[PDB]
Structure formats: structure tokens, C-alpha cells
Amino acid sequence: LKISHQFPGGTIKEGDFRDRLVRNFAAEVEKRSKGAMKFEIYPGSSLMKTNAQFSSMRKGALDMALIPLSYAGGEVPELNIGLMPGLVVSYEQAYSWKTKPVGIELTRVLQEKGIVLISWIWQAGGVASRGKPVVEPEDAKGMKIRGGSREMDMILKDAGAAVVSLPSNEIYAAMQTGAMDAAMTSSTSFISFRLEEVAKALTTGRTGAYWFMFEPLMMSKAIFDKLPKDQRDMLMTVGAEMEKFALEAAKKDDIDVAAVYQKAGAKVVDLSDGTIKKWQDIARKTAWKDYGAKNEGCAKLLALAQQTLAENLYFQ
């Protein structure tokens, strides 16, 4: 079975946690299945381009991939929820989605489009800038910035930025060549794409973040459904186990990224609660409106996601 992703390749012990994750997944499924299932890992878009992975899975042309979900928001607008500030406020709350109505609905929508959710993965982010740190939304005014998704970019546009769309594996080159002023991506990516080589400032997620992206490990439903039940169950069981690994790895990178950039000479700053709320309040007026209005499926997912915000405040 092939597993494709856009991130740098490494080993089980060392590298981009997403690459490590899928190698641990493969290794554990292999161990448990005793050779019945074997895997081949294709990092760094070595199998196919980043934007071809999702559709290939849907068609059964690609077995598995780990991809930012919202990259597919153009063909399936519902998926734009994968990066949309204000709906996710913490890792605990974001992972809680899985068994709640919002996660059940997201899973249902993906199944209808030919996709199985193997591991939930959420990642906090930040902003790297070729000049001043981008901290407050108003800092984006007049800058050209890659937000990472339609809905992140709708917020940036409101703030007066010009926005640029590209997959994160293309950030390094775009920053290098001055095609943009700043880029948002995950803590892990800031490290693995070596963006300290092409920026002077980093705004981290150490004291919280407004940017959280869903980057799940997924599998073609056409392929998954043809496998024997015992193998299907094993993929799902091991898949769920990977989520604790992703949780711990993303949090560690949220911290470690700061030291990487400091040692490289960058100006490194964090986000206050007040600043984070400013970005989330703009999201409600812009992104949430754009998303909810797109189709009834989006409206439904937005409503269900909002319940998890209330649960986070009012339940224990």
C-alpha cells in the first residue's frame, strides 16, 4: 500500500512528525498483520504533485495520503472547515470533534466523496515574515501573505492584505523569490521546510494560536472497502492510535520552532489572548459568513462546530 505526502522525508525516529507518523502507522500495521499488509512511503511529493493526491485517492488511484484537508475546498466546499479561525481554539477541543456531531458529519461527507479518515491530525501554526513580525490583524495591511486556505485568506483580505494561494511545500521558493511578504503554516512546517532561511521574523503559537489546520491521514474508500474486514479494522485501530502521537508531536514543535528561529537570528514573538481574539472576531464576520453561505452542508458543519465551542466553555 502506497502512502503519499508533500512533506520532507526522514526516518521513523527523526524528521517531520507527519512523515514519522505514517512510517509508525505502516510499521505497526505490518507488525500486527504479519506481512499481509505492507506499505511504501512517498514523501516530498515523490509519487505525484501535492494537488493530485486527494482526487487520486477518490478515484482509487492512490491508496493513502496525508494532506491538509482544506486544500480540496474548491471541489468540496465543506472541507474548508479544515482551516478556519475561531472554530478551533485548542487541541483538546479540536480533537474532541471526532466523536461529536461535527466529526461524524465531516466523516460522512468524506465517505460520500470516496475518502476514509484514518487519523485525525490538527496543527497549530504561526506566521513567518520577510520583514516585521505579523502579530495583529492590522499588521497584514498592505502585505502579500499566504494564509493557507480560502477562509484564512478571507480574513487576511478583510485586514487589507493581498493573498496568495499555494501548497505549503511551495512556500520556501515563494518567500525566497519575494513572491510574498509572509506565510502562515504549521509549527512543524516552519521547521521542516527550513523557512528560517527565507524569513526575518516568526510569530509562534507558544502562547496560543488562531491558526489550526486539519491535516489527516486518509485512504481511498474504493481500496479500503475491498480489503478483508480484519485488515480494515486494523487500519482503523492503528489509525486512531496515531492521533496521540500527532497531538504530542505538534505541541512539541509549537515549542521547538521558537528556538530554531532564535538560533537562526530571527525575531521571534508570541500571541496574546487579546490578539488571538481579534483574529477570531474578524473570522466570525468574514470567513464564517463566506463558509456558511456556500452551501447547506457548510452551514450544517459550521453549526455543529459551534456546539463544540459552547461545550468547551460550559461543560467539564
From Swiss-Prot:
Keywords: Periplasm, Signal, Transport. It is found in: Periplasm. Gene3D superfamilies: Bacterial extracellular solute-binding protein, family 7. This is Solute-binding protein Rfer_1840. The complex is comprised of an extracytoplasmic solute-binding protein and a heteromeric permease formed by two transmembrane proteins. The keyword Transcription does not apply. The keyword ATP-binding does not apply. One of its GO terms (biological process) is C4-dicarboxylate transport. Belongs to the bacterial solute-binding protein 7 family. It comes from the Bacteria. Malonate binds at residues 18, 71, 146, 168, 185-189, 215. It holds the Pfam family DctP. It comes from Albidiferax ferrireducens (strain ATCC BAA-621 / DSM 15236 / T118) (Rhodoferax ferrireducens). InterPro entries: DctP_fam (IPR018389), TRAP_DctP_sf (IPR038404). One of its GO terms (cellular component) is periplasmic space. Solute-binding protein that binds malonate (in vitro). Probably part of a tripartite ATP-independent periplasmic (TRAP) transport system that mediates solute transport into the cytoplasm.
